[PDB]
RNA sequence: CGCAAGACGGACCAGAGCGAAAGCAUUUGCCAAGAAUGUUUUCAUUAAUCAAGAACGAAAGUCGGAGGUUCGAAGACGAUCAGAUACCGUCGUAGUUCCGACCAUAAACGAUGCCGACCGGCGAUGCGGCGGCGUUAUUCCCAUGACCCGCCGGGCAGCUUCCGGGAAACCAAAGUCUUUGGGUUCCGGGGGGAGUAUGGUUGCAAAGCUGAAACUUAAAGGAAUUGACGGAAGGGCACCACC
RNA sequence: CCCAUGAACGAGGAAUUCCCAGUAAGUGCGGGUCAUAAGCUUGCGUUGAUUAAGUCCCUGCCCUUUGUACACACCGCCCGU
């Protein structure tokens, strides 16, 4: 005998300053009615945001998980929680008659963020190649995987969240692997396919307000 | 009669013969 | 039931998790999050007959009822997350998928980005039905 | 939605379970450069006008 | 009488491959034995792409595809008319139909 | 959103590789092993096949622990049906997973023992080596990768052929067979009875290996051809079909 | 033949037949039968349409490929208590 959506306040969602297009959308919460607080029950919502919505003019297939780390007031301030690939793109890349190569790196940034980057790579049929197969040797594959693991530790351990995400928005890690591995086996469709959030440090609001200018 | 189920019936029949020969020992 | 955003320019996006099994179809609009649901309707809610819970008509009625309840709370657009049963079972969306998606397009709503979110395993547990399978 | 008229420019085949429907290439005589394929009951020849109660369906070809 | 030279499967120097579960039934089929399709498919067929293009928020949005790999048992495949009985000469053609 | 446990390693994944076979598919490290190629290295007949004897041996099954996610014999229930101790469905114990011991069997198949020689062709492919215009990466060239073009050896195979063989299907081996002899092991002798009885032996058990006879019977069977039929696929026709 | 009596039947359930042009259907008249004789049949005109110029959906038939332990041939063959 009562409309439950009459008790909801539509709070706006803000992306950090490393993205061009600012606001993502809105998200309704219940008003602080008794013990439960809006802000406390709102502080763990994950937004799967296509990068073409979030950046002005980039590829659309990349997605960014964004948790509402803190709420200022009518503003869900978000922080990075994991890059992902649209399975449309991920499946599209995996075709027969070539070697799929993957490499995961359990890594830590300068500040207390622990990531789990997942690289992917596909051996390229050359311009003059008549042979259908286009496969790599097992030692060629694990030389590539060793390079992938080296390059991803190199481009995460030296810099912070904001700079590695500005390396994730282009294919700075993916294109560097694609360059470095030409001498081993020329592979073409080389991306970081997923980043996963494992540890964050104790929350500082000064750190998040530096992420939001 | 499938040759597998023939082999199953001959095993049960043997298993009853070993059960009935044992009771004189 | 008011999204207090500006009159014209800006759109109130949501996301509908369209779960199309072969023996039922769900149309489930949520907020950008997914954690706060706006409206949910299945096929078996609309049809008084157990055999055609997954029928494309049940999914059409479902999507129309959602898109009506969705326009009330002030949601203009929808992202889509199409889902099939998945796991060890079938990874094709059921016959209510295309009817429900077409229906809410026809029923006024705007369409953002579409993707499959089907639970595809690396390799799951042993699938139901025996060695010799589902004989009929 | 309005009730529109379309002219049969080509009668493609005979579809339907009992072959009871001509499948027809129709040209919209309002928007004179828009054409769709469309199922029709009864005897149809080239250059007779169909009354469409909606102009947004399109039949699946033979 | 030996009907197929390969024995209807594609192992020559193994003696065992892993069983896949048939997608239609749940039948356990040797991987090499199974009749495999790779269905790329647009999430909407023909009638709904007309509607999405008009009710899309975006500027000439290319629609996403749904990448299934179907594994069939021989019985499911023939019943569902994926494969088909052929003449003893025409059986030997390994060319996929156009 | 998380958290936990236990299974399993999709897509890449192939008439691809490796392994004596059973079998083997996430990453990284360690531990020993192995084929093939390369060799103007060494020993110098050390070999091939094998009664006895020995190692390994899918799944199921057994005994003692650890674990129990899913699936699931038995079981209970709901359906179908005339009945339905089936097929379908909801649950569901043993089991399925791990360690330690058994077990020793599979349509364990290539239904094709191993070693050796000889006898057409062609395109591929996997591994190693060798040679060759040219593109390409390390750019700063060297030499290595990625391709391309050939050669050689060994490998899984493939296509073609009046080698030749075969009852034929078919087979570069199932050929070199009445023009019959390269070496060697196992094994068959019409169909049943019967892999039964009985004795031995192995096993905790289930069962394994070895293994008859009386009696019974004119066929059982193999390949191929023509028909008929099909609840297999496709094509065509008819107001004694339909619309 | 005459007078008289004046029942059901208010367009037909499941199912099913025949038919595309002078056709269907309406309508009578001949022939066969016939001593007596048409609710039948076989012919003839007369009046004269609806719909369709298609398909393999149903029902049959015929193909081609396929499988077979069938061959007086699926009403076949055949297994166990």
Question: Approximately how much helix is present in the residues of chain D?
Answer: under 10%
Strand residue content of chain C: 15-25%
Number of helices of chain C: 2
The main β sheet of chain D shows up as: 4 strands, antiparallel
Distance between the termini of chain C: 51 Å
Q: Could you describe the largest sheet of chain C, including whether it forms a barrel? A: 5 strands, mixed
Q: Which strand order does the major sheet of chain C show?
A: 3-2-1-4-5
Q: Roughly what fraction of the amino acids of chain D lie in strands?
A: over 45%
Q: How far is it from the N-terminal to the C-terminal residue of chain D, by CA?
A: 29 Å
- The multimeric state of the shown protein is part of a larger assembly
Sketch the topology of chain C as an H/E string, one letter per element. Answer: EEEHEHE
Shape of chain D: globular
Number of domains of chain D: 1
Number of helices of chain D: 0
Relative helix content of chain C = 10-25%
SSE string of chain D: EEEE
What does this protein structure show overall?
- The structure is cut from a larger assembly and holds chains A (213 residues), B (25 residues), C (136 residues), D (62 residues) and E (98 residues).
- With 25 residues, chain B is an all-alpha fold.
- Chain B is built from 1 helix and no strands.
- The termini of chain B are far apart.
- With 136 residues, chain C is α/β, with parallel strands linked by helices.
- Chain C has one domain (1-136): Nucleotidyltransferase, domain 5 (2-Layer Sandwich).
- Helix content of chain C is 20%, strand content 23%.
- Chain C is built from 2 helices and 5 strands, in the order E-E-E-H-E-H-E.
- In chain C, a hairpin with a 4-residue loop joins strand 1 (15-20) and strand 2 (25-30).
- Chain C is elongated.
- The relative contact order of chain C is 0.21.
- Chain D is an all-beta fold and 62 residues long.
- Chain D has a single domain, classed as OB fold (Dihydrolipoamide Acetyltransferase, E2P) (Beta Barrel).
- Chain D is built from no helices and 4 strands.
- Chain D has strands at residues 4-15, 21-28, 35-41, 49-52.
- A 4-stranded antiparallel β-sheet of chain D has the order 3-2-1-4, with no helix packed on it.
- Chain D is globular and about 30 Å long.
- The relative contact order of chain D is 0.37.
- Chain E has 98 residues and is an alpha+beta fold.
- Chain E has a single domain (1-98), classed as Ribosomal protein S26 (first zn-finger domain of poly(adp-ribose) polymerase-1), CATH 3.30.1740.
- Chain E has helices spanning 49-55, 74-79; strands at residues 19-21, 28-30, 35-39, 68-72.
- The chains are: A alpha+beta (213), B mainly alpha (25), C alpha/beta (136), D mainly beta (62), E alpha+beta (98).
- The interface between C and E is medium-sized, with 31 and 25 residues.
- Chain A binds 2 RNA strands through strand 6 and helix 4.
């Amino acid at each position: 005998v009562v409309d439950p959506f009459s008790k909801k306040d539509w709070y706006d969602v803000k992306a950090p300053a490393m993205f061009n297009i600012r606001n993502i959308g809105k998200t309704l919460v219940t008003r602080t009615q008794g013990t439960k607080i809006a802000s406390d029950g709102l502080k763990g919502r994950v937004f799967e945001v296509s990068l073409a919505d979030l950046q002005n003019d980039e590829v659309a297939f990349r997605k960014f998980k964004l948790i509402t780390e803190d709420v200022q007031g009518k503003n869900c301030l978000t922080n990075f929680h994991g890059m992902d690939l649209t399975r449309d793109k991920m499946c599209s890349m995996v075709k027969k008659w070539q070697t799929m190569i993957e490499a995961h790196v359990d890594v830590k940034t300068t500040d207390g963020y622990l990531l789990r980057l997942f690289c992917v790579g596909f051996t390229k049929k050359r311009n003059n190649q008549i042979r259908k197969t286009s496969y790599a040797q097992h030692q060629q594959v694990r030389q590539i995987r060793k390079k992938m693991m080296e390059i991803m530790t190199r481009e995460v351990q030296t810099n912070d969240l904001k700079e590695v995400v500005n390396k994730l928005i282009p294919d700075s890690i993916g294109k560097d692997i694609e360059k470095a591995c030409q001498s081993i086996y020329p592979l073409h469709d080389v991306f970081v396919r997923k980043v996963k959030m494992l540890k964050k440090p104790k929350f500082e609001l000064g750190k998040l307000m530096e992420l939001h200018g | 009669m499938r040759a597998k189920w023939r082999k199953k019936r001959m095993r049960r029949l043997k298993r009853k013969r070993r059960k009935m020969r044992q009771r004189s020992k | 039931s008011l999204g207090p955003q500006v009159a014209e320019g800006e759109n109130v996006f949501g996301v509908c998790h369209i779960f199309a099994s072969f023996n039922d179809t769900f149309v489930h609009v949520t907020d950008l999050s997914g954690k706060e649901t706006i409206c949910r309707v299945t096929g078996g809610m609309k049809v008084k007959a157990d055999r055609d819970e997954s029928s494309p008509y049940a999914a059409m009625l479902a999507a129309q009822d959602v898109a009506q309840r969705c326009k009330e709370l002030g949601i203009t657009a929808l992202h889509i997350k199409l889902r099939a049963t998945g796991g060890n079972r079938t990874k094709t969306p059921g016959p209510g998928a295309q009817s429900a998606l077409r229906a809410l397009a026809r029923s006024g709503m705007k369409i953002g980005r579409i993707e499959d979110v089907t639970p595809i395993p690396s390799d799951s547990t042993r699938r139901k039905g025996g060695r010799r399978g589902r004989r009929l | 939605q309005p009730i529109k008229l379309a002219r049969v420019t080509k009668v493609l085949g005979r579809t339907g379970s009992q072959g009871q429907c001509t499948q027809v290439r129709v040209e919209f005589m309002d928007d004179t450069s828009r054409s769709i394929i469309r199922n029709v009951k009864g005897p149809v020849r080239e250059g007779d006008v169909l009354t469409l109660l909606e102009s947004e369906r399109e039949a699946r070809r033979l | 009488t030996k009907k197929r030279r390969n024995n209807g499967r594609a192992k020559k120097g193994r003696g065992h491959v892993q069983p896949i579960r048939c997608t239609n039934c749940a039948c356990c089929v040797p991987k090499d034995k199974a009749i495999k399709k790779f269905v790329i498919r647009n999430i909407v067929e023909a009638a709904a792409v007309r509607d999405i293009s008009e009710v899309s928020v975006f500027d000439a949005y290319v629609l996403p595809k749904l990448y299934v790999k179907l594994h069939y048992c021989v019985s499911c495949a023939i019943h569902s008319k994926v494969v088909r009985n052929r003449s003893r000469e025409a059986r030997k053609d390994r060319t996929p139909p156009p």
